[PDB]
Amino acid sequence: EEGKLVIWINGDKGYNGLAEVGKKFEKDTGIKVTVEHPDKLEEKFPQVAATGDGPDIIFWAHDRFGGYAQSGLLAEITPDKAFQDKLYPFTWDAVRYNGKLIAYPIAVEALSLIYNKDLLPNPPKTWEEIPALDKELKAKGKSALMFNLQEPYFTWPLIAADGGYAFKYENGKYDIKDVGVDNAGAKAGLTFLVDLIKNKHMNADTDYSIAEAAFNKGETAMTINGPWAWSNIDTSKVNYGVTVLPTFKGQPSKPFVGVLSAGINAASPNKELAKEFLENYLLTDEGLEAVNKDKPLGAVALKSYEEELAKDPRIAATMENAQKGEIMPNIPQMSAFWYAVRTAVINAASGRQTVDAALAAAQTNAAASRTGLVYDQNMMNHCNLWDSHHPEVPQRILRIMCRLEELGLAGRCLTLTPRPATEAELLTCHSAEYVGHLRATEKMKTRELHRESSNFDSIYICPSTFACAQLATGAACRLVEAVLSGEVLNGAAVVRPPGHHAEQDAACGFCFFNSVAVAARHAQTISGHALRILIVDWDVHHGNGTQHMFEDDPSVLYVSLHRYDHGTFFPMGDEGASSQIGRAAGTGFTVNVAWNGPRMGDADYLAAWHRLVLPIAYEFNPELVLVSAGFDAARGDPLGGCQVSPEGYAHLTHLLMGLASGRIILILEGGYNLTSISESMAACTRSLLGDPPPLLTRPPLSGALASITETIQVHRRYWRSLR
Ligand SMILES: OC[C@H]1O[C@H](O[C@H]2[C@H](O)[C@@H](O)[C@@H](O)O[C@@H]2CO)[C@H](O)[C@@H](O)[C@@H]1O
Ligand SMILES: CC(/C=C/C(=O)NO)=C\[C@@H](C)C(=O)c1ccc(N(C)C)cc1
Ligand SMILES: [K+]
Ligand SMILES: [K+]
Ligand SMILES: [Zn+2]
């Protein structure tokens, strides 16, 4: 930490060549330089940098660096004017933010039309030729064009062709409120891309690895990639040329030009050493050549070595595309921009969403991603007719919303309008028999309802009970549709009655329709395949209904922490035991952390999060996160006997946001202390809105730690993150 020097750089670059520079630096001064390449490190770095941890030196394109600087995660760079002249002036401007410098420039990288020179000696200079050109090749069992579709960076040069742009630039300023994502040029651009996939030319499944292996095996005429790719293309038995990007509507393609940059972490005590390595060991003709021999950097920022590299007709072709395109903005809103376009492209190019709809949703979130709120006051109609002392009261959801408005959190959200669940939605998790039974209760009276209520375990029914349960589930499904279509990033569904106890053909524990489960299955239908879903049930009671509903499903990872009391705590079974790991092909996808005894608190739940939940969750890698967010495990709750603070819930929430690219949906379950649940829900909503987690306090209970490790033992043979 003070005697070392660790550096991060993306896996597509030449990290091995950088290690060699770290070896010729370790030998010179004695300091060991370790270079690792984490996945999704542009997301990983701002996580650790905030909480003091992280690498000494960060490597990435300049577009992300302004976000890091706005959070004060980067150290200010102070090079003398002598070294300043050593690079091109336009590269320094890319890493200049709010006056200060915040990174060392390394190389300029722009996309190019790499193409096979054998199967296709003449590269089409227009995008419009490609479908016809694919016809002539698809007969010979060969494709025409394949490139990465899972990242918006690769399809952007086509979107920007006819007039699409991110944020408008005038003078020195970027107008956050001026976005050209849903304008004609951008729409015409993506429309043409989707049509390629519409007509069986390109496949939507195509990613970086698939597309590279296709071109390298000589079964794809053209591809789109950066200088870094060239190295792998050489070893390949493929003769390749690099030229200008094809035109769209007679317009030159405009790729988003990026600059490979190196920043110093603010928490690094090794700053001076950081300055020494980057300036006098990396940014030299010798150092830059070491990396470039591994993977081509492109057009480097260093004047001396650039003159040598500029003889390359490929680098010249890289400069041609870069000049026709535009240099990426460094403003801290780029992260929200790239996520919007990523969602829009994936959605539209699949068939789920349309060009008009997808771009319209992205247009609204280029500046910042929104958080959705969904709630209906009519859900208060469901009430107990013979017992006013029952804890599941209509005041539960009102007190929450009323508190969200007091703190002004509700206004900072994008309030979604709910709707009843369609018959199809409910039939995915509940039988038509049980649904009909429950709808029949609508026209019963208090006497008939009493006998009807005694048919189930811990249930009260009133004439409104069907409309409310139908609304709670339908509301959560609306939230699903919102997140999965780029309307929001994450959201909260303040609803009642609860649902995680509801079985397929039976009501139980104040539940009728399992809203979380229906939402899970619903999410998989609108995507059209078995989407990977994570369900975290941090309610103080075990969600027996949810577990049984996905007991054999390996596409839905269900995690639950709850009072067990040796099978005595409600719902009273052994179904919530730690040894219950699901069955069949879903074995290992049912995780039960079972508490023995009361007073489980913050330190207890945080222990489980770091030792079990997060490792398993990350290995599972969900594409959507649903939370049975009951707050009866909270402090001051009359039923749960636990002491989790609102500050604690905020941390648990904020920690789960690193999953599924931040796609989370908190759906309310239990919680019966009006002040405790409204406070906890507010603290959670704060975390969802990007607000920083508060400070905390109180060692882990021993019996809790016993409980935790007890269930990792049973799961250690099904999860490598537990080994
Ligand atoms: O796809 C969005 C992505 O675009 C850019 O990332 C590039 C990067 O610049 C290249 O060096 C290489 O790693 O390909 C990446 C895309 O796969 C932006 O730099 C990045 O912020 C953004 O997420
Ligand atoms: C069903 C349940 C938990 C539900 C939940 O929160 N699921 O998530 C708790 C039951 C066992 C309970 O303890 C109880 C206590 C008092 C009471 N009245 C004073 C009316 C009614 C019920
Ligand atoms: K639970
Ligand atoms: K499961
Ligand atoms: Zn509960």
Ligand nearest to the CA of 570: 2
Ligand nearest to the CA of 500: 2
Question: CB neighbours (10 Å) of residue 579?
Answer: 11
The three-class DSSP label of residue 658 is coil
Helix axis angle for 184-198 and 130-138, nearest 10°, is 10
Burial of 695 (C-beta count, 10 Å sphere; 0-12/13-18/19+)? exposed
Is residue 249 within 8 Å of residue 40, measured between CB atoms? Answer: no
Tell me which residue of 226, 259, 247, 248 sits closest to 114, measured CA to CA.
Answer: 226
How far is Cα 537 from Cα 530, in angstroms, rounded to an integer?
21
Residue bearing the CA closest to ligand 1, atom 22: 338
How far is Cα 44 from Cα 46, in angstroms, rounded to an integer?
6
> Which atom of ligand 1 lies closest to the CA of 151?
1
Ligand nearest to the CA of 616: 4
The Å distance, Cα 577 to ligand 3 centre, comes to: 11
Question: 640 vs 55, 539, 643, 653, 705, CA distance in Å?
Answer: 41, 9, 9, 20, 19
The three-class DSSP label of residue 259 is strand
Q: How was this structure determined?
A: X-ray
The Å distance, Cα 509 to ligand 2 centre, comes to: 7
**Helices in 110-218 by DSSP H: which ranges?**
130-138, 156-159, 184-198, 208-216
Residue bearing the CA closest to ligand 1, atom 4: 153
Identified catalytic residue from 62, 201, 382, 501: 501
User: Which residue among 8, 13, 153, 326 has the greatest number of ligand 1 atoms within 8 angstroms of its CB, and so is best to mutate?
Assistant: 153
The Å distance, Cα 156 to ligand 1 centre, comes to: 11
Q: Does residue 338 have its Cβ closer than 6 Å to ligand 2?
A: no
Is residue 241 within 8 Å of residue 115, measured between CB atoms? Answer: yes
Q: Does residue 63 have its Cβ closer than 6 Å to ligand 1?
A: yes
The 8-class DSSP code of residue 109 comes to E
Beta-strand pair 112-116/220-225: antiparallel
Specify the CATH number of the domain 355-722. Answer: 3.40.800.20
- Cα–Cα–Cα angle for 115, 118, 119, nearest 5°? 80
Residue bearing the CA closest to ligand 2, atom 17: 390
Q: Does residue 458 have its Cβ closer than 6 Å to ligand 2?
A: yes
Q: Does residue 609 have its Cβ closer than 6 Å to ligand 2?
A: no
Q: Does residue 572 have its Cβ closer than 6 Å to ligand 2?
A: no
What are the structure tokens assigned to 110, written together? Answer: 């722009």
Q: Is 501 a catalytic residue?
A: yes
Q: Does residue 602 have its Cβ closer than 6 Å to ligand 2?
A: no
Tell me which residue of 601, 606, 629 sits closest to 494, measured CA to CA.
Answer: 629
Ramachandran area for residue 74 (φ above 0: left; ψ -120 to 50: alpha; else beta): beta
**Helices in 365-464 by DSSP H: which ranges?**
395-406, 423-426, 432-440, 446-453
Helix axis angle for 355-363 and 184-198, nearest 10°, is 140
Resolution expressed in Å: 2.8
The Å distance, Cα 574 to ligand 4 centre, comes to: 17
The Å distance, Cα 402 to ligand 1 centre, comes to: 42
The single residue listed with the structure tokens 């709808």 is: 439
Ramachandran area for residue 537 (φ above 0: left; ψ -120 to 50: alpha; else beta): beta
